[PDB]
Each structure stands twice: as structure tokens, then as C-alpha cells.
Design a binder for this molecule. Structure first.
Ligand SMILES: O=C1N[C@@H]2[C@@H](O)[C@@H](O)[C@H](O)[C@@H](CO)N2C1=O
Ligand SMILES: CC(=O)N[C@@H]1[C@@H](O)[C@H](O)[C@@H](CO)O[C@H]1O
Ligand SMILES: [Zn+2]
Length: 1014
């Protein structure tokens, strides 16, 4: 295993270092506004060294943006694809590339057999080529690597089955910034080449000047280079035709033949395109070839890539003709005029890459190596796209919840082969596809129109229902005596109970377990643990009585804690935000111990009085002029008091101190240790009255944030043996700090209401000597070192916080883990801040046509970990990466993949069993079975189950952490006949594993295996 901590990779271009050196000056470079006047030696080419030009026709189709997926399909895409089939069939030399498989699949299944055969033929002959082959062209900032792989697999699996092809070249022309997580996954999925476009204009200029636009992109910790994937970065401002033929858009626009009038399009540079004729082809070619030759000066080979397309292009038949015939005339002239020394033709992306590498092997070019990412993107001036790291936070949080339900549903149902009548495969396919669709760069990014966001939400809601159905049917089968099991595939044996989504204060949807002497004395509940190691975790349920006790299936009592059900209300009358307690609903909390990738059953029983093993939390409402708070049967009376600082400590864990406004002020790890200053504070950012306005994409603050006026907020303190908390009703936010014995959990019920042109940020102020350094993660896969640059505006220092961020000095580190992707940064030494929500009144001129005024209450969740790290073996100062500690990683897992809770629906569960998976290996803490999915339907003689195994890297800080069993995924199911290592998409076998054993992976490595069973 390569060491991912101690060896600083030696690369030609390291983005953090590059950023440190760059001046980022935004000067007018001429026709190429953000570049310079490119010059080339005409004698560079001759009959012995020609310029090979590949014009690649394409059509960018958004699976939702200003119209819904289905709306675009009916209005544009089905026509584009139908005419593409016709035109490519009739013109053998014409080419076309396609990226979004969600649309292709939607179109394909509506075709007759005659057309399906014609389609298979033009793909087979190379005219129609799929690039990337994912369900969508995913966002690369907010997306979790697990979902990026999910959507890639959904698209490629469909392609292999129906088109018999698997793309090895990726095309990403629209994501707003790019992440190294992509080459990571692609390289492990058979890819050999990739292309990106949206990168900071300053970076494009810098790399173009050194001809480093094509590079071998390796991971920041990879010293050997085995993760390297050849990458091509386009050099200009856009992927449209005016910005892809050469440096001068005024000239290139003349070669977009759809802009002549009848199509309702024109050239903003004022010179229209002109139909090519024998009388002007020489002058036209001279202009075009000159553009090509200038673009060619930016690359290292004599092979040039010229994309030809734009949004939803190549729709009308007349459009196909106008682009094809005119370019055909240019090619004939150019290719026959020796003095040009050019050979131009229509081609595909793979053809371009193949030619480049043939040149490379001929020794005409040596490519540079590069590590780092391409955030935060800016397309012009100070317009940085850091706003979408937070836009529509409700759906960003929903993405993470569905991510987990999909994993749990596929895993729980994978243990058995199911009858088609169970509709398991059906429901799972829908769930995977709806979540996959949302990975689109206008989905999770929060940059779509309001009705399109509603469509995505509806689709995800259906996906959640689908996973619940599969999950509960699975639990019933896994925990019911075989000879008793009698399933009704349409029946709900269990109901999922989720305490954090939509969340308290967002939607009152969780069911209360109703117990009563005259109705039902007890109820069975089941917990599921998707993680490959034993796990204990407090779980809670709503019960109709406070006198409830818990036991496991062996009837052993389990220590429990009952607390009231508190809900906050903005009191329209008194004009205050205060809590109300339930008088008929209570929360029971207890620790559930669940096997690796397994299940554990518990029983809740009612009694007339306080049961021996159940304690009751105390409650303190702090504020002036309080009123009574009755709680029905609740044993203890609520206490009151004037606002005052308070301190709490659950178990033998950390001691937390709070201000009189209910906000964290300090943390004391041990009774010896000092009270470390850790202050939570809420501030607001505004919008400029002059210049450009912030919108769904852009973050253009009107200076540093200003503190939110808190007034005298009401604070509620709940103190219990197992769980305690401090909640405060602040303007726009009900802030809660929960303590269960270890790292505290933070929950924010965010309701920005009608506060227009306001962005709410949560900041942590400490004394940590972090300087200008901080760390943020990329797609929940790796942590990259960031350096605050004062030479760049505030918004440029904001980065995606998909799962976590941290700051540290020689001895102390503060890590904030998130349960949803949001934007954040460290604007000053010792600080950390993350945006909660943003309501913007205007459009930010990027095509959306609206501001963001559809905010809705959302429950954001986090874990705050303060740790001493002076004893940890950390990377040297020059290393571009950072790594979490064991505690921080486990805290992240508690947020992203919590235990699942099921409540038995009926009154009696006959044949109920107490546990499943007790014999499953409890793997090392840094190892995870990211995906478990049965790949075969019941009718297959040889059953196949695929597994994706990921091992992160945790810092060694002096903790013995030992005794754990080896996990061999290939033996998790009986009767294994063979074990093979496959690409991450399970589509290609790479190794036949001897002994049928799947070996564990190295730190930061990800592997996929498929076990076959007879
Ligand atoms: O013409 C445009 N093309 C891209 C779209 O494809 C869309 O997904 C982007 O959000 C949006 C970002 O500006 N886009 C445009 O305005
Ligand atoms: C779809 C089909 O049956 N056609 C075959 C395919 O099975 C085979 O894998 C491929 C090799 O690339 O050659 C095609 O002609
Ligand atoms: Zn797009």
C-alpha cells in the first residue's frame, strides 16, 4: 500500500501552489478577452507536419433546468434524438456525441424495433458516440462520491445492456467547477480520458501560456501516479460555437450556421454567419483555419479538438442540414488546398483522444502531471460561483437522506433473491434513477426554476417511499421464522421512523407508538446498521405514555430515558419564539446495539408507573416573564429562570458551557483540561446595491457579514442521563446543541422567512492558530488543504463543504461535519463558517431568469469535534491533503449513515426473531461496504452480488485501536462459486480471485467485487 500521508507527490502543476503564485489579474486581452493575442509560425506546418482537426458535433441537454426533464423531453430532446437518428443514418461521415443517458433511455424505450435496430447500428459503426455515459452530467461540488458512482453505473449499465458499449472517454462541459473525485472514479471504472470546461479564467490563461491544458490528473496524495487520468481542459469562456473554434468569438460566431435569422438566433459581435459557396469558401476557410491554428498553439500535439454545439442543438432537420452542408464545403476546400497543411473532418471525442495519444507515442509530445481541484469557479471579473454551494438547501439535505435510504434498501434486499411479484427490482430501479437524476448540475446545485425544483422533490419523495417499501419487506423476511413467513408484497409490516428528516419543525410526520392497557401493551421496533462493524447508538421513538420500558428480544432490560416532545413556535401575538411541550406524546431514548450490516429487535412496554430502568430528563426554560408549561403525564415539572450562562456534561464526556443566549462558548474535553473557547455565532450577508447581484449561482456579498440581532431569545435546557441539550429560538433559526456523551450534535431548524437579499451564516470563533489554512472535503471522499487568499474577494474564498471542514494548529483541531452540502470558509485565523440558507430577490444573469425566493424550513445537522492533535502523525507542511481522526470520521458516519428504525405495524409479530447478522465480520473502522447490490434477478441459475469497498485514511494519534476481523465480502453469502474484482460499475471483470476471497483495500482506495453463487 502506498503511504498517503508522508510522501509529498512531485507534480508539474499543483493547484494550491499555483494559486499561491498567480496574480489573477483581469485584463482585457483583446478579441480573446481573458487571454492574449495568439501568434503562430506559419511555417510550423507543411506536407510533413499537418494539423489534424476533429470537429465534434454535440448537443447539451439539461435533465431539467428552466423546464422539467419531461418538459424538455417532449419539447426538444426527443426531436433532437429522432432527427439525429435520421441524419446520421443518411450521412455516413457525419458524427455526433451524446452524454445524458437519462434522456437516451427515455427515448429508446419509446422506439419501435425498426428504429432501435437503426440506432444500434449507428452506435456500432461509430457515428453516434456516448461520452461518459452517466445518467446525467453531475454537479461536482455538492455531490457525494457515492451518488456520482450511482448515476454513472445507472447510465453505463443501461448502455451495456441496450447499446453494447461502455464509454472510456468523459465529457463534462457544464459543471460549475471540477473535482478530482471524477478522475478518481472514472479511472477505477475503465476510463482512459476526460474533458472539462468550467475552470477559472485566470487558470485557463495560466495553463494555456505553458501549454498545460492537457495533463495527467492524479490524486493529491498519489506519489506513484497510478490514479492518473489524461485530462483535456478547454481553453475558452464557453462551450458554445463562438468560443470553441478559436480565440476570437466574433469570427467563430460566423461558423455557427444556425445563427442566420430563420432560427431566431444571431451573432452579438454583429457579423452574421454566411452560407458557404464556391465564391467565398477560400476567404471563409482562411478565416477559420487561422482560428484553428491559433487554438492549436495552446496544445502540445498536431491534433486539434473543435467542439460544434450548444444547448439543445441539432433539433430541426434544417439545422442538421445547415451545419453539415456548410462544414462539408469548408472541409473539401481546406483539405484540398495543400498550402493549408490541414486535414479536417467530423469526428468523435474518442477519435480525438486516440489521435492525440498516437502522436504522443510517436514522441511528438510529453504531458505534464497535475494534482488539485478547480474550485471556486469564476467565469468573468469577480463573479465567483460559490452561491450554488448553498442554494435550495432543503433539497441538498434531502439528497443525503435519499443517498442513505438507497444504500440501505439495496443492501437489506440483497440478502435474498426475490420473486418478481415482490416488485423489488422495480422499486429499487426507480429509487436509483430519481436520486441519479438529482445529481444533475441544475439539480442538487439548486439552480433550477421553482417548478423544476418541485419536480425533483416529488421524484425524490417517491424514491423514499420506494426504499421504505423494499426495506420493510426485507426486515420482515430477515427476522421472521422461515416456516411462518407469509408475505403480502403490498402490505406494510413496518413503518420507518426518522427523527431527522424532514425533521421536527419542518413536518410532523413521524408516527407515535400508541400503547395502552385497553389497546396494546407493547410494540416491537427494529434497528438496521448498514455499516460493516458493530455499532451502538442512541435511538428515539415517540410514545403515547411516559411510563415505557425497553428490553431486547431476550427480555433483558435496557436503560432508557424519557423526555418531552418540544416544538417551537413563532408567537404572532407576543412576538417571541418559545417552545411548547406535548401533553400526549413523549420521546423515549435508549442505546441500540446492532450487528455489522445487520438488525436488532427491541420491545417497548407500557406500565402504570415509572419503570425501574427508565429515567426522566429535567427541563429548564430560561427567559423573563415565563408562563407555565404543562406536560400531561410527564413525571417532572418544568423549571424556570432568568437567562443565564449554563454548563452541561453527559456521562464522562466533554463539558460544554453556553452563553445566556443559549450559544456554545467553550468546550472542556476532560475535567483536567482547560475550557477551550469555541463560540457559535450567527451572522448575515447582504446583496450589493450597485454592480452585480447575488443569485442562485453567484455569491456577491456587500462586505463581511453583520451579526444577527438576537434580542433576548428563549432558551430551553433539557438534562438527562443519556441525552441533554440546549435549544434557542433565534431569528430565522432554532439552534440546538445535543450531547450524548461524545462529540456534540448541532441541529439548525432554518426558516429564512421573507428576509430578502439575505444569506444566513453560522460561524465558529476560536483561538486556534490556523492562520490562512483550512481544510474542506471533496464529495465526501477526501479532504483538501485550502489557503485563504486576500488577493481574491471574499466569495472566492468560499468552498464546497459537502461533508466536512476543519482548522488546526500544532496542538488543537476543530472539525465540523455536515449532514448536507453547504458553502463555507475560514475568513480569519481560528474561524470556520458555513452558510445555512440564502434568499435572493434578483437574477444573477446566468440564464435562470429568477432569484431564489422559494425557501422552505430545513433541518441542518452537524457534529462538532474538538481534539488535541499534537501527537498525531500528520502530513508535512507541503502536502496538499489532510485526514480526519477516528472520532471525526465516526461522527461523519453518524450523520450520513445512521441506524435505521422500523416500527412493527400490526399488533402482534408472529415468529419474530431478535437479531440478524450476528455472525457478520466486524471490519476495521476505516473500511466501509459503500455498496451491496444483487446484480441478478431470481430466474438466474448463477446469482451475482456486487460490492463496493472503500477504505478511508485515518490519522494515527496514539490509540491502540486493535482486534478487528478481516472482511471478505465474497463469503457474506453462502455457496460461493467464484469471486472477481470488477470495475466500480461492476461491468467488467478485472481479476479472478483465488480461493474466492476478496482482499481488503488500501487506504484511500476503492475496489469492487462480485461474488457468484450456485
Ligand atoms: O446557456 C447556458 N447553458 C448552461 C445550462 O446548460 C445550465 O445547466 C446552467 O445552469 C446555466 C449556467 O449559466 N447555463 C446557461 O446559462
Ligand atoms: C451486442 C452483440 O451481441 N454484438 C457483439 C457483442 O456481443 C460483443 O461483445 C462485441 C465485442 O465488442 O461485438 C459485437 O458485435
Ligand atoms: Zn447544463
Amino acid at each position: 500500500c502506498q503511504d498517503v500521508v508522508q510522501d509529498v507527490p512531485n507534480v508539474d502543476v499543483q493547484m494550491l501552489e499555483l494559486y499561491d503564485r498567480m496574480s489573477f489579474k483581469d485584463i482585457d486581452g483583446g478579441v480573446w478577452k481573458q487571454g492574449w493575442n495568439i501568434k503562430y509560425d506559419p511555417l510550423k506546418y507543411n506536407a510533413h507536419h499537418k494539423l489534424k482537426v476533429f470537429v465534434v458535433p454535440h448537443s447539451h441537454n439539461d435533465p431539467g433546468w428552466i423546464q422539467t426533464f419531461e418538459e424538455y423531453y417532449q419539447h426538444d430532446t426527443k426531436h433532437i434524438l429522432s432527427n439525429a437518428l435520421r441524419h446520421l443514418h443518411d450521412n455516413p461521415e457525419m458524427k455526433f456525441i451524446w452524454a445524458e443517458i437519462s434522456y437516451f433511455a427515455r427515448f429508446y424505450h419509446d422506439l419501435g424495433e425498426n428504429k432501435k435496430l437503426q440506432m444500434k447500428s449507428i452506435v456500432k459503426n461509430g457515428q453516434l458516440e456516448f461520452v461518459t455515459g452517466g445518467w446525467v452530467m453531475p454537479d461536482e461540488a455538492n455531490s457525494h462520491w457515492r451518488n456520482v458512482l450511482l448515476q454513472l453505473t445507472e447510465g453505463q449499465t443501461w448502455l451495456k445492456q441496450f447499446m453494447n458499449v461502455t464509454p472510456t472517454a468523459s465529457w463534462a462541459i457544464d459543471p460549475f467547477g471540477h473535482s478530482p473525485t471524477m478522475p478518481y472514479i472514472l479511472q477505477k471504472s475503465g476510463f482512459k480520458n476526460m474533458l472539462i470546461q468550467r475552470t477559472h479564467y485566470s487558470v485557463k490563461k495560466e495553463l494555456a501560456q505553458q501549454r498545460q491544458l492537457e495533463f495527467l490528473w492524479r490524486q493529491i496524495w498519489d506519489n506513484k501516479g497510478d490514479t492518473a487520468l489524461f485530462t483535456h481542459m478547454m481553453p475558452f469562456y464557453s462551450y458554445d460555437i463562438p468560443h470553441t473554434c478559436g480565440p476570437d468569438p466574433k469570427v467563430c460566431c460566423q461558423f455557427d450556421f444556425k445563427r442566420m435569422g430563420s432560427f431566431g438566433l444571431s451573432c452579438p459581435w454583429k457579423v452574421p454567419p454566411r452560407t458557404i459557396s464556391d465564391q467565398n469558401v477560400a476567404a471563409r476557410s482562411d478565416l477559420l483555419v487561422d482560428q484553428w491554428k491559433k487554438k492549436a498553439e495552446l496544445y502540445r500535439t498536431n491534433v486539434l479538438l473543435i467542439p460544434l454545439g450548444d444547448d439543445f442543438r441539432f433539433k430541426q432537420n434544417t439545422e442538421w442540414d445547415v451545419q453539415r452542408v456548410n462544414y462539408e464545403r469548408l472541409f473539401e476546400h481546406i483539405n484540398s488546398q495543400a498550402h493549408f497543411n490541414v486535414q479536417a473532418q467530423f469526428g468523435t471525442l474518442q477519435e480525438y483522444f486516440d489521435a492525440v495519444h498516437q502522436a504522443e507515442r510517436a514522441g511528438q509530445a510529453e504531458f505534464p502531471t497535475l494534482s488539485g481541484d478547480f474550485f471556486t469557479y469564476a467565469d468573468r471579473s469577480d463573479n465567483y460561483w460559490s452561491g450554488y454551494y448553498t442554494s435550495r438547501p432543503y433539497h441538498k439535505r434531502m439528497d443525503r437522506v435519499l443517498m442513505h435510504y438507497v444504500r440501505a434498501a439495496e443492501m437489506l434486499s440483497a440478502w435474498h433473491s426475490w420473486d418478481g411479484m415482490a416488485r423489488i427490482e422495480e422499486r429499487l430501479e426507480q429509487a436509483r434513477r430519481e436520486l441519479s437524476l438529482f445529481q444533475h448540475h441544475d439539480g442538487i446545485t439548486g439552480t433550477a426554476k421553482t417548478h423544476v425544483v418541485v419536480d425533483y422533490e416529488q421524484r425524490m419523495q417517491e424514491a423514499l417511499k420506494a426504499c421504505q417499501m423494499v426495506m420493510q419487506q426485507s426486515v420482515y423476511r430477515l427476522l421472521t421464522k422461515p416456516s411462518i413467513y407469509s408475505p403480502d408484497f403490498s402490505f406494510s409490516y413496518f413503518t420507518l421512523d426518522d427523527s431527522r428528516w424532514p425533521g421536527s419543525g419542518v413536518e410532523d410526520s413521524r408516527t407515535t407508538i400508541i400503547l395502552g392497557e385497553d389497546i396494546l401493551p407493547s410494540k416491537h421496533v427494529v434497528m438496521h446498521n448498514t455499516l460493516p462493524h458493530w455499532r451502538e447508538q442512541l435511538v428515539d421513538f415517540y410514545v403515547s405514555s411516559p411510563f415505557v420500558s425497553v428490553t431486547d428480544l431476550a427480555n433483558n432490560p435496557v436503560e432508557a430515558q424519557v423526555s418531552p416532545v418540544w416544538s417551537w413556535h413563532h408567537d404572532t401575538l407576543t412576538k417571541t419564539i418559545h417552545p411548547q411541550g406535548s401533553t400526549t406524546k413523549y420521546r423515549i431514548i435508549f442505546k441500540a446495539r446492532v450487528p455489522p450490516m445487520g438488525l436488532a429487535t427491541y420491545v417497548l412496554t407500557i406500565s402504570d408507573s415509572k419503570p425501574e430502568h427508565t429515567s426522566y430528563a429535567s427541563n429548564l426554560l430560561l427567559r423573563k416573564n415565563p408562563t407555565s408549561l404543562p406536560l400531561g403525564q410527564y413525571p417532572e415539572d418544568v423549571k424556570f429562570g432568568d437567562p443565564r450562562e449554563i454548563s452541561l456534561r453527559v456521562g464522562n464526556g466533554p463539558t460544554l458551557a453556553f452563553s445566556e443566549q443559549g450559544l456554545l462558548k467553550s468546550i472542556q474535553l476532560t475535567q483536567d483540561s482547560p475550557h477551550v473557547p469555541v463560540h457559535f455565532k450567527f451572522l448575515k450577508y447582504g446583496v450589493r446595491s450597485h454592480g452585480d447581484r447575488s443569485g442562485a449561482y453567484l455569491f456577491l456579498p456587500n462586505g463581511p457579514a453583520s451579526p444577527v440581532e438576537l434580542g433576548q431569545p428563549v432558551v430551553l435546557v433539557t438534562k438527562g442521563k443519556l441525552e441533554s441539550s440546549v435549544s434557542v429560538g433565534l431569528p430565522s433559526v432554532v439552534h440546538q446543541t445535543i450531547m450524548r456523551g461524545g462529540a456534540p450534535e448541532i441541529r439548525n431548524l432554518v426558516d429564512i422567512g421573507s428576509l430578502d437579499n439575505t444569506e444566513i451564516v453560522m460561524r465558529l470563533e476560536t483561538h486556534i492558530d490556523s492562520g490562512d489554512i483550512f481544510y474542506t472535503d471533496l464529495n465526501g471522499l477526501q479532504f483538501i488543504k485550502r489557503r485563504r487568499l486576500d488577493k481574491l474577494p471574499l466569495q472566492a474564498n468560499y468552498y464546497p463543504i459537502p461533508s466536512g471542514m476543519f482548522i488546526e494548529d500544532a496542538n488543537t483541531r476543530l472539525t465540523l461535519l455536515t449532514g448536507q452540502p453547504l458553502g463555507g470558509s475560514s475568513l480569519a485565523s481560528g474561524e470556520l463558517e458555513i452558510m445555512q440558507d440564502r434568499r435572493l430577490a434578483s437574477d444573477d444573469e446566468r440564464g435562470l431568469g429568477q432569484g431564489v425566493l422559494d425557501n422552505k424550513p430545513v433541518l441542518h445537522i452537524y457534529r462538532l469535534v474538538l481534539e488535541k492533535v499534537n501527537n498525531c502523525v500528520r502530513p508535512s507542511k507541503l502536502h496538499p491533503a489532510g485526514y480526519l481522526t477516528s472520532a471525526a470520521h465516526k461522527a461523519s458516519q453518524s450523520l450520513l449513515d445512521p441506524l435505521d428504525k422500523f416500527i412493527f405495524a400490526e399488533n402482534e409479530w408472529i415468529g419474530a426473531q431478535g437479531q440478524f447478522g450476528g455472525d457478520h465480520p466486524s471490519a476495521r473502522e476505516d473500511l466501509d461496504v459503500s455498496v451491496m447490490r444483487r446484480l441478478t434477478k431470481s430466474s438466474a441459475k448463477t446469482q451475482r452480488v456486487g460490492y463496493v469497498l472503500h477504505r478511508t485514511n485515518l490519522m494515527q494519534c496514539g490509540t491502540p485501536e486493535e482486534h478487528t476481523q478481516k472482511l471478505d465480502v465474497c463469503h457474506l453469502l453462502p455457496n460461493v462459486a467464484r469471486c472477481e474484482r470488477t470495475t466500480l460499475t461492476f461491468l467488467q471483470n478485472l481479476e479472478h480471485l483465488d480461493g474466492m476471497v476478496a482482499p481488503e483495500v488500501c487506504p484511500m482506495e476503492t475496489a469492487a467485487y462480485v461474488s457468484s453463487h450456485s
